[PDB]
Amino acid sequence: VYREKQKKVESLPMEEYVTGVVASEMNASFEIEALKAQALAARTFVVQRMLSGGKKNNADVTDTDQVYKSKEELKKQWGNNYENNLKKIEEAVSKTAGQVLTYEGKPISASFFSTSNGRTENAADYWGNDYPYLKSVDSPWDQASPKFTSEQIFTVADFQKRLGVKVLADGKVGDIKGRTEGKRVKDVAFQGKTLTGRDVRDKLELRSSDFTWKQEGDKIVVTTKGFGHGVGMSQYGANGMAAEGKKYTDIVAHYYKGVEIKTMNDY
Numbered sequence: 001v002y003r004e005k006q007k008k009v010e011s012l013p014m015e016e017y018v019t020g021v022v023a024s025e026m027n028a029s030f031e032i033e034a035l036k037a038q039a040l041a042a043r044t045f046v047v048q049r050m051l052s053g054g055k056k057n058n059a060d061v062t063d064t065d066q067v068y069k070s071k072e073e074l075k076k077q078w079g080n081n082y083e084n085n086l087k088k089i090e091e092a093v094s095k096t097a098g099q100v101l102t103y104e105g106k107p108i109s110a111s112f113f114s115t116s117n118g119r120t121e122n123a124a125d126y127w128g129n130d131y132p133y134l135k136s137v138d139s140p141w142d143q144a145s146p147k148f149t150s151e152q153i154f155t156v157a158d159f160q161k162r163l164g165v166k167v168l169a170d171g172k173v174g175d176i177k178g179r180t181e182g183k184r185v186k187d188v189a190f191q192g193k194t195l196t197g198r199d200v201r202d203k204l205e206l207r208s209s210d211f212t213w214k215q216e217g218d219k220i221v222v223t224t225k226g227f228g229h230g231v232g233m234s235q236y237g238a239n240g241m242a243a244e245g246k247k248y249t250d251i252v253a254h255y256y257k258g259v260e261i262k263t264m265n266d267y
Helices: 014-025 034-053 071-078 082-095 141-145 156-163 199-206 235-243 248-255
Strands: 099-103 149-155 175-179 185-190 195-196 211-216 221-226 260-263
Touching: 014 034, 034 248, 071 082, 071 185, 071 221, 141 185, 141 235, 149 211, 156 199, 156 221, 156 260, 195 199, 195 221, 199 211, 235 248
Parallel strands: none
Antiparallel strands: 099 260, 149 221, 175 185, 185 195, 211 221
């Protein structure tokens, strides 16, 4: 077997691929230490993919694949600042070249999401065994995020159809039965049917599973806190930490409990 001498991913040098993933996933205007943290997370998923068949899907504990932005569209996103942003992301990647996030020697599920509701989530496998590096932590910087609070409006008929339920008479829609350690909704009950908060988020395409709701006339107004699954690293949180002077190593240590930064050469 003739083995390729250079590390390539979809025909590109590995580090350049990482640069592309970072730019596709985190806003370029974010602090450099936050981008460095995102590069470890992207590189962690890349190495994992390559070490297990070279498949395209990440070994993410959360439900997901997503866009790898082209230059054409990064110019439209970054407008004229394209050049400076590109170089910023390149520095962040090269500065962390070869670094990945591990736990007990193996690459982790370096899960990330845009904005928390104030906290991240505990994650466990299908059988309920905890992922020890995905623990619910405090993420107070997200309060100041532009995507912290949000509202989504649905007609009663659409809402009822999408969730396959009849709304409560109280005008209270559906009763929220409990919250997670991350303060996200655990379960919702309607007359004769119950759904998990996560299932409600998917069926309605909510910004997050931390929500409250009310009925206004023939409409349901849903107010969410956060944006994304809430597992692992908050992007807005990492930026907040970086704004108060913390390094990428501090950021990852905060969001992934007990994580160890290794060089990939070992593998």
